[PDB]
Structures are given as C-alpha cells and as structure tokens.
From a paper:
LmrR is a transcriptional repressor regulating the expression of the multidrug ABC transporter LmrCD. In the apo state, LmrR shows high affinity for the promotor region of LmrRCD. This affinity is reduced upon binding of a drug at its drug-binding site, enabling expression of the multidrug transporter. LmrR is a homodimeric protein with the drug binding site at the dimer interface.19 Central in this binding site are two Trp residues, W96 and W96′ (residue 96 from the other monomer), oriented face-to-face at 7 Å from each other.
To investigate the importance of π–π interactions for drug binding, the electron density in the π electron cloud of W96 was modulated by progressive fluorination of the W96 indole side chain. To assess whether the Trp analogs influence the overall structure of LmrR and its drug-binding pocket, crystal structures were determined of LmrR with bound Dau for LmrR variants 5FW, 5,6diFW, and 5,6,7triFW. The crystal structures belong to the same crystal form (space group C2 with very similar unit cell dimensions) and were refined to resolutions varying between 2.55 and 2.15 Å. Although the crystal structures show generally good geometry, they all suffer from high crystallographic B-factors (average B-factors for protein atoms varying between ∼57 and ∼89 Å2), indicative of static disorder in the crystals. Nevertheless, the electron density maps were of sufficient quality to identify the Trp analogs at positions 67 and 96 in both polypeptide chains of the dimeric LmrR variants. No major differences were observed in the backbone and side chain conformations around residues W67 and W96, compared to wild-type LmrR.19 Moreover, as shown in Figures 2 and S6, the binding mode of Dau to LmrR is not substantially affected by the presence of the fluorinated Trp analogs. Dau is bound in the same way as in the wild-type protein, with the aromatic part of Dau sandwiched between two Trp analog residues, stabilized by π–π stacking interactions. Thus, we conclude that the different Dau binding affinities observed for the LmrR variants are not related to conformational changes of the protein or significantly altered ligand binding modes. The binding affinities of LmrR for Dau and RBF decreased upon increasing degrees of fluorination of W96. Dau behaved less extreme, with the kd decreasing 6-fold.
Author numbering:
A (entry chain B): 5 to 69, 74 to 112
B (entry chain A): 5 to 68, 73 to 112
Write the structure that this text describes.
C-alpha cells in the first residue's frame, strides 16, 4: 500500500528529527543503521517529503558548519507528533477492547 | 487531520471484520462500545469506506430473524493485514534502534 510506505517513511523521518536536527546524508545513514541495511531511503523522496513538511510548517531548515543544510522539528512539529501518537494510542485501545469484547 | 482519521477508521473496521463477519449496524455498535462512546460511526461513512474496500477486494458482502447484509474480510484482506501489521512492527523496531543508536 504505497500510501502506507508514505506514512511509515514519514513516521521514521519525524522520529529522526525529534532525536535532533539533521541533514539528509545523516538521516539516510542513521535509518540504514537502525534498519540493519534493509531500508535505504532515496534523496529525491527525502527532498520531496521534506518540502511538504516545511510547506506545512512541521519542520524548518537551516544552514550549519562543513556547511550543510540542517532540518529541525518545529513546535507545531512536536505538537502534531504528540496528537498523532495519542490518537493512535486510542486506536490501539479500541482494537484491544474489540478483541477482549470478542472472548466475552 | 482527516487523512489520519480516515486511516484510523479503516484500521478499526478492518480489525472488527478480523474478529468476525458483521453487518453495518453491528459494526457501529461494537465500535461505540470498544470506544466507550467516543467513536460513533454513522452508516454513510461505513458504506463509503466499504465501497472502496470491496472494489479493492479487501472485503466482500453476502446476505444473512431479519435479513442483514454481512461483510467479510477476504483472503487478500487477511494477507494485507499481516503484511501491514508486520511492516509496522519493522518500523517500531527501527525507531527503537534509532533511539538506541542515539545513546550508544
Ligand atoms: C505512532 O503511531 C503512528 C503515528 C502516526 C501515524 C501512524 C501511526 C501508526 O501507528 C500507524 C499504524 O500503527 C498503522 C498504520 C498507520 O498508517 C499508522 C500511522 O499512519 C496503517 C494501518 O492503519 C493499516 C493496517 O492500514 C495499521 C498500522 O497499525 C498497526 C498498529 C496498530 N495499533 C494495530 O495493531 C494495527 C493492526 O497495526
């Protein structure tokens, strides 16, 4: 489900930045390690995805020394991630009740 | 965030059918109870989603002391749920390794 890799990739990316600001080569690098080599994200997509988020104010960009472009999570970024994790937590619960309410 | 509520609703409906075949009013009830009244789905929304899923072969329908239309998860349905649940566990792990690679 190609809309789902979109989300999965977005989730992982968001988590990398919540760790701390980072640049694309560093981001692809960290992800490939944490996935023990199974996931190589492509620049075009990271550059592609990163445009949407800054467009929506979830992340912002800044140049740091040696000079590479760095990306950081904004507050609306931190907030929207919190709402995401919490809503999805309620979903976990709804589903768990369904399973439990099943056995009864 | 309406792209995420739609995604969440699809998970729940799919997980209801994974519990067992059911009709629309039956589904709304089970969801209302598992969410202690927080997620009250209306008919129209389920018909909308079920039309898409049936078109994509994820679910099918058949007739069941009153006559009800029942919906069922197809064989392809279960398989996508396994691939989905699995791809999503892989993501969880990746994120733990990112956090692990952080401290380490
Ligand atoms: C931090 O959580 C998130 C934060 C932002 C976006 C997301 C998620 C998220 O957790 C998430 C998912 O867990 C799943 C999906 C998803 O899109 C997201 C996000 O977008 C896709 C999925 O909806 C399917 C089958 O289509 C199910 C899958 O849930 C997993 C875990 C569920 N609790 C449940 O067990 C389900 C069966 O598989």
């Amino acid at each position: 489900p190609k809309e789902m890799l979109r989300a999965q990739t977005n989730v992982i990316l968001l988590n990398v930045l919540k760790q701390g600001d980072n640049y694309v080569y560093g981001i692809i690098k960290q992800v490939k390690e944490a996935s023990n080599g199974e996931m190589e994200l492509n620049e075009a997509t990271l550059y592609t995805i990163f445009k949407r988020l800054e467009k929506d104010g979830i992340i912002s960009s800044y140049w740091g020394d040696g000079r590479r472009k760095y990306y950081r999570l904004t507050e609306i970024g931190h907030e929207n991630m919190r709402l995401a994790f919490e809503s999805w937590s309620r979903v976990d619960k709804i589903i768990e009740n369904l399973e439990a309410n099943k056995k009864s």
